[PDB]
Amino acid sequence: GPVPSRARVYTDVNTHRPREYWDYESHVVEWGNQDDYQLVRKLGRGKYSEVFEAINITNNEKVVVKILKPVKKKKIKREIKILENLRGGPNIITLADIVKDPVSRTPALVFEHVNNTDFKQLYQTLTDYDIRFYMYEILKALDYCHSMGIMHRDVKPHNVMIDHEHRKLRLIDWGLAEFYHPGQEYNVRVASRYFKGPELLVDYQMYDYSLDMWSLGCMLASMIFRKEPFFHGHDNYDQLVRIAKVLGTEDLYDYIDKYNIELDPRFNDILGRHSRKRWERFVHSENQHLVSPEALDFLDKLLRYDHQSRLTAREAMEHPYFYTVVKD
Numbered sequence: 252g253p254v255p256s257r258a259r260v261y262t263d264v265n266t267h268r269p270r271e272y273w274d275y276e277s278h279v280v281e282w283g284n285q286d287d288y289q290l291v292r293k294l295g296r297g298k299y300s301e302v303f304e305a306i307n308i309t310n311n312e313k314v315v316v317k318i319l320k321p322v323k324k325k326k327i328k329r330e331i332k333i334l335e336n337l338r339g340g341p342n343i344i345t346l347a348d349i350v351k352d353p354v355s356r357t358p359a360l361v362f363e364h365v366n367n368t369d370f371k372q373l374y375q376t377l378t379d380y381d382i383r384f385y386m387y388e389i390l391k392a393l394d395y396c397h398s399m400g401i402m403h404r405d406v407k408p409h410n411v412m413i414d415h416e417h418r419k420l421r422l423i424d425w426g427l428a429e430f431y432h433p434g435q436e437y438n439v440r441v442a443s444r445y446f447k448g449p450e451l452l453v454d455y456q457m458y459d460y461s462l463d464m465w466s467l468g469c470m471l472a473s474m475i476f477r478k479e480p481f482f483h484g485h486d487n488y489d490q491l492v493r494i495a496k497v498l499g500t501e502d503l504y505d506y507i508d509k510y511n512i513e514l515d516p517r518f519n520d521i522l523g524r525h526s527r528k529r530w531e532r533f534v535h536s537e538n539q540h541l542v543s544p545e546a547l548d549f550l551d552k553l554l555r556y557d558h559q560s561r562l563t564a565r566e567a568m569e570h571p572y573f574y575t576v577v578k579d
């Protein structure tokens with residue numbers, strides 16, 4: 252059987268919290284007034300919810316309303332409990348209210364509004380300094396939620412709302428987030444394909460906060476190298492092959508051998524043999540203004556096969572890449 256694993260930091264935070272902190276199945280939702288919120292325009296639709304811009308008519312301020320599609324009550328309670336636990340934290344989206352939508356017959360979560368620019372266009376304009384600044388801001392949110400016993404499990408550009416005018420960032424969409432408990436086996440069907448960590452792609456269930464650090468490394472690689480997404484797999488099997496063409500197959504085998512994991516035999520025909528690459532091969536004249544020795548070393552320390560070898564969020568914030576970022 253597989254070798255067990257523990258987070259190297261914040262391992263026992265939920266153990267010593269009161270049970271009501273992490274026992275979301277017992278959470279009692281405090282419902283607000285559904286008539287406080289007038290929907291203005293639909294912003295998007297996903298498989299789990301629809302998202303609207305709305306106005307809170309008690310203060311005439313914009314809010315964002317996520318009306319959930321039918322899903323399990325425990326998953327709705329999990330997201331609500333996590334949002335309430337994290338509320339007030341650095342760069343965490345604020346849950347302002349929870350109401351019962353009379354049409355959908357489901358809960359509607361009401362969030363603070365961020366005047367965001369879509370990442371496709373925003374990422375074309377970010378400078379080297381901007382990328383370091385916003386990476387540091389994401390790390391504040393990730394160290395906070397990890398320190399609070401929670402892994403986000405869906406870090407990707409679409410879930411980082413940036414108001415570039417005010418240099419404001421919020422980490423959003425906590426619907427896949429979970430409480431970390433030592434020894435717990437988790438569902439590997441989390442995160443978006445391009446941001447899935449190797450642990451998910453080899454079906455290793457006893458993972459932890461370090462998953463979010465792989466996803467963040469994938470974001471960083473796409474930004475400094477101007478290739479979005481960086482690891483561009485056509486399915487979950489090809490995703491691991493794309494990773495192995497950069498990190499190499501020998502260290503992939505070291506990873507699965509450490510945890511006494513077997514690869515899916517369907518990789519026998521597609522994985523090949525690949526040396527580990529040096530990050531300098533991805534630098535060219537059109538991205539070199541975003542690349543520095545510090546950026547490559549930082550990236551190299553996030554993108555490790557072994558989840559136990561990745562920088563923690565706090566360690567990442569100590570990295571020389573962030574020395575040029577102004578801290579007040």
Ligand SMILES: COc1ccc(/C=C2\S/C(=N\c3cccc(Cl)c3)NC2=O)cc1O
Nearest residue numbers: 295296297300301315362363364365423424
């Ligand atoms: C414009 O500013 C904001 C935008 C979004 C949020 C909060 C969201 S959106 C979300 N899930 C999504 C995402 C896309 C489509 C679908 Cl259907 C669901 N999960 C959150 O927490 C908050 C803001 O202030």
